[model samples]
Target chain A: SKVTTVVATPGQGPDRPQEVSYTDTKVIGNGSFGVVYQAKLCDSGELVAIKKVLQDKRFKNRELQIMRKLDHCNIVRLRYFFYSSGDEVYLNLVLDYVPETVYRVARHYSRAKQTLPVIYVKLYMYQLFRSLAYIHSFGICHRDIKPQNLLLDPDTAVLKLCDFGSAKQLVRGEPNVSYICSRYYRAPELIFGATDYTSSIDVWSAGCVLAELLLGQPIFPGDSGVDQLVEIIKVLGTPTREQIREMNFPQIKAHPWTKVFRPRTPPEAIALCSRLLEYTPTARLTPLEACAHSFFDELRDPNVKLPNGRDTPALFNFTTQELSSNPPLATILIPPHARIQA
Target chain B: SKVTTVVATPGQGPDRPQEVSYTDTKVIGNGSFGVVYQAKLCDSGELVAIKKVLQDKRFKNRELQIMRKLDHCNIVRLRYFFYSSGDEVYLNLVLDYVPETVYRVARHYSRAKQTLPVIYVKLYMYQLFRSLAYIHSFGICHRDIKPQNLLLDPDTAVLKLCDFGSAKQLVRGEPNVSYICSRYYRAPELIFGATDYTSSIDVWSAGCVLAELLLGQPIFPGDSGVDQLVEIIKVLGTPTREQIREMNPNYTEPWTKVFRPRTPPEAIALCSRLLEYTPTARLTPLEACAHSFFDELRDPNVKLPNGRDTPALFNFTTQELSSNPPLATILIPPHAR
Candidate 1:
């Protein structure tokens, strides 16, 4: 398939470029299919990020269509993209550059136990939910939801959900026939081998994020698919024969191995995780429900006046003295030593 | 103006008769001046959402034209909406039910002495930016970007950016004429009175959201137009005399009592806060710049064995566990006493 060009403008003059171009400095991150670069957006004279995809036959024009249409704060923003028609398709994407240090700096300031504070968890969860909600609202489902797929703007602490190679849109009542998403965050229905799922599949992965936030580790730390199931059963308990039958699956049968695992009450760290990791996707708490859970309820005090008082906008007011000056800027700055390798 | 039918589908019967009728749940959220509702698909027993509007409104008709043509993951899905006539004109919408909690929920969660965790702040800010980026891709500006306008689904951690009442398609080279966005989240250009602004205005408000998440409070807590300007200048510092001269003539200049309060870096939390403060100026850390403050720089250590060796479907091997079941039966079941 031929690549489509919606809008293409020439780069700026010699001194200043119209299109922000970056030389591949270093491979900041790499995946099974593509690699990300720590590049620069020269047009704006600002340091920006770039993700370039090494062309392959499997990820064709269909994949490009999915990637091009994706736009959301939680999701990585694709600034400018172009693909070469060479032997190996080279697709370059200009993106909002997030300093590498924010994650490290954040880790330093994070709670000692490595668990994100409830307040931070709630806020990020809200943003993630809003992002997913917006995507779902547009009839698309981010089949993949995990921390690695989520990015953060270090300075602003803004989280961007990235990677949409597996996303699919469901026009109301149209069943999502594909089974996507990582194993650890995969929903129970998928475990029963259900192909037709909904946005609920993404919600289940988000639930995994919530758990990961609280526990400060992967909830289902399974080495393999069977290991992941075993871990889930150990923590959440095995499904009963009737529950298995309820899913209307002919292949699944309750066995003595299932009886060995028992559901145990999650520790205080993940009080709300269980509700989202339910056996039935339909029975799982939607994103809104997770936000209202008592887990977040305990973090807030309704009786006390907010920091800036009753005013809606006033609550955000911050004066010089009140604001934290000398914030750890050095922490977010990209290390000079780090370089992108071609 | 006649309300054009965006979509039409069977209404889903209420699970409980006591709940408001699907039809009566007036389509409160629609493009321009239309109405929207949470309805049911009678035949399929599927619970679907909708949008509607009256025929006489100018914006509704224009909204229908733009909305019907749009199809994206970030844009609102126009499942099936249409118009109905009576003593008063009305448009009906059937959209996906987004049982959402507004960003206002953060208001209830704010702590007195402490700021919100950096992770959460990063997440909200990132999401807001991504949403605007998507909106901008379609050459559309979501004139309004406020906490109240954004909806959150608690269960899935899904946040839906809503209320495109003032959205306008951006024609290349032609600037937008109208001023929009909520008071506090409004950009400096909009407040200083710039008639020609681009999608950057939305980016500015998204910057404010970062501060709101960080402080667990709003960045600009202004009520009146004057107060808002004062609040902006206090933190960002007054724009240069040259900057002030560029605003709309009607734009009010700040008085000593309102403006001469604090230095720029001292008042604001970060440099990006002043991105739109100056006339025809861009902030230093563009949305693309990376900050070390949020990223942990931890190596991506997840083990990914070759795909060929693993099972095609990992779901089949997993068992159902119900360790922590939600107390609420319905999506947001009424709080039990």
Candidate 2:
């Protein structure tokens, strides 16, 4: 209940700092970067997460800069950012505090010897695809896209993607690090040390997350850099000589998709995963294409609801820019019941 | 030079602390565990590395415990250990400071666009096998074995294994973490999630180190746990059906043994025998010592290319000589004995 005050600048609007106060602070997580604390906003009484990392005096933090450029329902909103100086400078980002992550939710079901409900899987993966589509539209790649970064509001089943520490506004000719994403979700091109990769890398990662949610474990749990490809090869079958060439880089039976998933998994879900987890980045489905896939069609239904008998989270709330990517799919993406006037 | 003194306990013998002084301190290496500093002992003027790690305040540090029980020429010798306190507790280990590593040495050759001298590879790997045989004799498995952990005295060409952070005493029927060892050097058994492994795991790692020294890069550079098996399978060929059953656990063309254009037949044969998919099928450390590839080391008159005598390869203690009595004849040259 202890109150702390600071002068902070809004993430999207004015750069000028304004005095803000918060209370009930406790550490929620920590890593080499710094500590993240869960706190309550004094004026609004709303819960928030403050990611406090050591600030390098030489340059601006990329996460703060990128978060300012992003605005979406499925992306975690950055409310404000503040700096504290002492022996070392600390940059604190106050963000919408979602209590549980898709990681913890999956862990809960795994420990209970159960699987995440197919409906929740549909809800989570669909929102993830939507967030990817939104960011990819801006030429921004969310380099890290594991379950831990997917924040979920259990009551509404609404999902928000967080952690832009590794995100970047990718330019066509420029190069990025091949070792960007988490190992489990790393695209084949990244593993082959591709730096001139497109936003499609994030699509591959989202595919891994979708598979993990359905399988109750990571799809390609490689122990080292090379093993990751092997795990992928075991499931996807060895890459064709031509496929390897496409990776800028194998022949050996693509594992049957039916055997990769649970016995009762929907065939549509398997079809969607196959399209997203392709060896050739361009061959994979676009984020918007993933949303329009049959696997997620249930979310587009007018009568869909949470198993708890609650209305489903907003699935058809698309900006014109989002809908503009593929004008042909607009009819499929927005249902008749959820249509809105621009 | 600034002199720092601490009351330190010897890694071997008495558990009591003695006031030891050192000067010219500078950090040499570091990781999540802690920092390593290079310092010169005031009493002996010998340069030593002081590994300082944060003490957990729980039970004893495993590295320290293991260091006290070990005494070997090929393994880094821990001279003394001391405790420091402030905002946090720190455990400082003073050890013989070897100036180079196999990793760095190989890196030097790689950058210069040359291969490591076959003689040096012979020297370093023989010493490594000697170390492995010594530790394996005592049931200790150096869970982490890679070129980086292999310390070298550039002048003497002596190789000493360092970094006991992941080392452990393997007891049969006792389980250990399968996720041990660096990715490139991990044994197939470990990657297959086998916990009831043996000292043979160390042999597999030594084989990786040997191949790396020869190839000038890691042999099995897996990106993930599963990819590691793929890399191994790519080179070693897939494990037969029986081989997987043995691993407590792959088919593909067994890669060519003559990986390099002009790799020696003896060296190729030795590597093939050591890197078997079956853990038991791999040559024992002592048997590896008797391999014909190293018959050059056993030659009493064969001196280092620098015109210096070879490292004390024949100075096997009674404990070592007794490891395998039949191989002792081939392990030691007649003139040397």
Q: What lDDT does the true structure give each of the candidates?
A: 0.51, 0.82
TM-scores for chain A, candidates in order? 0.67, 0.95
CA lDDT of B68 in candidate 1? 58
Task: Summarize candidate 1's per-residue lDDT along A32-78 as a digit string, tens digits.
Answer: 24677776443444665556766666646444566566554555665
Off by over 4 Å in 2: A340-342, B1-337
Per-residue C-alpha lDDT of model 2 across residues B241-304, encoded as one tens digit per residue:
8998777531111435437777777777788888888998999888888888888887767887
Chain A TM-score of prediction number 2: 0.95
Worst ten in a row by lDDT for model 1 chain B: B312-321
User: What is the overall TM-score of model 2 with all chains considered together?
Assistant: 0.56
Candidate 1 chain A least-lDDT 10 residues: A311-320
Model 2's alpha-carbon lDDT is: 0.82
Best by lDDT: 2
